[PDB]
C-alpha cells in the first residue's frame, strides 16, 4: 500500500522453538565486527548478504511462513498484505514499466531472510534492477531495513531522487 500504512494485514506467523532469537534481536542491533559479519561477507568479491545474488521470480507465497510485513520497492517502499486465493486474520488461517515491482525481500517463520525478484539481464537503475540493491553499496531505506540487513548498520543515510520521478531515502556506506 502507498503512503507506508499497513493496518493489521501483516502475517504474525513466527516460530519460537529455535533459540536463535531473531525476533528477540529486534530491540537492539550488534556492531559490525560484533556479529561475525566479515566471515559471511567474504563470500562475494568487493568489486542475501551482499549484492551478489540471483533472485528468482515469485508469483505467490503461502502466508503460513511469512513473519512480519512484506516490504517491496517500486523502488518506493510498498507493503502487500495477505489475500484470498480481503481476509483479516493476521495470517492465522513485474517491472514497474510493465506494472508491479521488480522484486523484494521478506522474513520467514523459520527465521531466515529470503529474496525473490525479476531475472538478471544478460549498469542501470530502471531496467535490470531486481532487489533493493540500487547500486553496489546503496540500499533503499525502509523502517524494517535493519532487521533484514543487520550487516548494514554502519551505512550512512543519504537522500536521492530517481527517474516517472521517485523521491526516496537510500542507505550507502563510505
Amino acid at each position: 500500500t502507498n503512503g507506508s500504512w499497513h493496518i493489521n494485514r501483516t502475517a504474525l506467523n513466527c516460530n519460537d522453538s529455535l533459540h536463535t532469537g531473531f525476533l528477540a534481536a529486534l530491540f537492539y542491533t550488534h556492531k559490525f565486527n560484533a556479529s561475525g559479519c566479515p566471515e559471511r561477507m567474504a563470500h562475494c568479491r568487493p568489486i542475501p548478504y551482499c549484492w551478489h545474488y540471483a533472485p528468482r521470480q515469485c508469483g505467490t507465497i503461502p502466508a503460513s511462513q511469512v513473519c512480519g510485513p512484506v516490504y517491496c520497492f517500486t523502488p518506493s517502499p510498498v507493503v502487500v498484505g495477505t489475500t484470498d486465493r480481503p481476509t483479516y486474520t493476521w495470517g492465522e488461517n513485474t517491472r514497474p514499466p510493465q506494472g508491479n515491482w521488480f522484486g523484494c525481500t521478506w522474513m520467514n517463520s523459520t527465521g531466515f531472510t529470503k529474496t525473490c525478484g525479476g531475472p538478471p539481464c544478460n549498469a542501470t537503475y530502471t531496467k535490470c534492477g531486481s532487489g533493493p540493491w540500487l547500486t553496489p553499496r546503496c540500499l533503499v531505506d525502509y523502517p524494517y531495513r535493519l532487521w533484514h540487513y543487520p550487516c548494514t548498520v554502519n551505512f550512512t543515510i543519504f537522500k536521492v531522487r530517481m527517474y516517472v520521478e521517485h523521491r526516496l531515502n537510500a542507505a550507502c556506506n563510505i
Epitope: 493496518i7 513466527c14 529486534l26 537492539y28 542491533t29 550488534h30 560484533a34 512480519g68 523502517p143 535493519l146
Partner: antibody, heavy 111, light 107 residues
C-alpha cells in the same frame, strides 16, 4: 493518594498504536528513590510478542488494546521493595536507545 | 549476569572539563548511550550510539567508546550541568543501566 494494599495489583498505561504501523518500541523503567534505573520489559505494537526481564518474570504482564490505542502493564503482588517511580519511554525501532521519556508515576505501599 | 560500573561522584570547577567513565567487560563491542537526569525531572537523552549527539544539546558534550571503557567528556562545565548521568547497553537480550554518577560543580 493512597496505599496500594500488599498483595494487590497495579497498572501503568502508555500510548500505543491504534492498529497501524508503529515505528517505535515501548518499554517501561522504574526507579527506586535515588537508587538508579532498572528495566522491566518491552512490547512492539506491530508484533504481538513481548519481552520480560528475568527478575520480574513471575509478577509482570503486558497487554494492550488497539481500540483505545492504549497499552498497559499489570504488576501483581506489590511489596515494600516495589515502591518506586515508574517511567515510560519510546525510542526508534532498532537503534537500541530510548528517547522521549514520559512523566513520572509514583506507586507506594505500606509493607 | 552483567554489570556496568561508574564512579559514585565527580567534582570539578567552572570552566574545566570532567570525564565520566562507564567501564565494563568487553564493553567496546556494544553501542552505548548516556542519559542525563536533573533532580525531579524525567531523564533526557544526551547521547545515542556513542558519539552521535541529538539535535538541541550543546556541542560541549562529547563521548567515545573503545576498549573496556567508554567516556563522556564535558568542556566548559557551568552551573547548569549538575545532574546524574546514566549509562546504557544491551547484553544477552537484557538491558543494563549503570550505577548513578553524580556530577557536581563547585562554585
Amino acid at each position: 493518594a493512597e496505599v496500594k494494599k500488599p498483595g494487590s495489583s497495579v497498572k501503568v498505561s502508555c500510548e500505543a498504536s491504534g492498529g497501524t504501523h508503529s515505528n517505535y518500541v515501548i518499554t517501561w523503567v522504574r526507579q527506586a528513590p535515588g537508587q538508579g534505573l532498572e528495566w522491566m520489559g518491552g512490547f512492539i505494537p506491530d508484533f504481538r510478542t513481548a519481552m520480560y526481564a528475568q527478575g520480574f518474570q513471575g509478577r509482570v504482564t503486558i497487554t494492550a488494546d488497539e481500540s483505545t490505542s492504549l497499552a498497559y502493564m499489570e504488576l501483581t503482588n506489590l511489596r515494600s521493595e516495589d515502591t518506586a517511580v515508574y517511567y515510560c519511554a519510546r525510542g526508534p525501532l532498532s537503534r537500541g536507545y530510548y528517547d522521549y521519556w514520559g512523566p513520572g508515576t509514583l506507586v507506594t505501599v505500606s509493607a | 549476569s552483567y554489570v556496568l560500573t561508574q564512579p559514585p561522584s565527580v567534582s570539578v570547577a567552572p570552566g574545566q572539563t570532567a570525564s565520566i567513565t562507564c567501564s565494563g567487560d568487553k564493553l567496546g563491542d556494544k553501542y552505548v548511550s548516556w542519559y542525563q537526569q536533573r533532580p525531579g525531572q524525567s531523564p533526557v537523552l544526551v547521547l545515542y550510539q556513542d558519539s552521535k549527539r541529538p539535535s538541541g544539546i550543546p556541542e560541549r558534550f562529547s563521548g567515545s567508546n573503545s576498549g573496556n571503557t567508554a567516556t563522556l567528556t564535558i568542556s566548559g562545565t557551568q552551573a547548569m550541568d549538575e545532574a546524574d548521568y546514566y549509562c546504557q547497553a544491551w547484553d544477552s537480550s537484557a538491558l543494563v543501566f549503570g550505577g548513578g554518577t553524580k556530577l557536581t560543580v563547585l562554585r
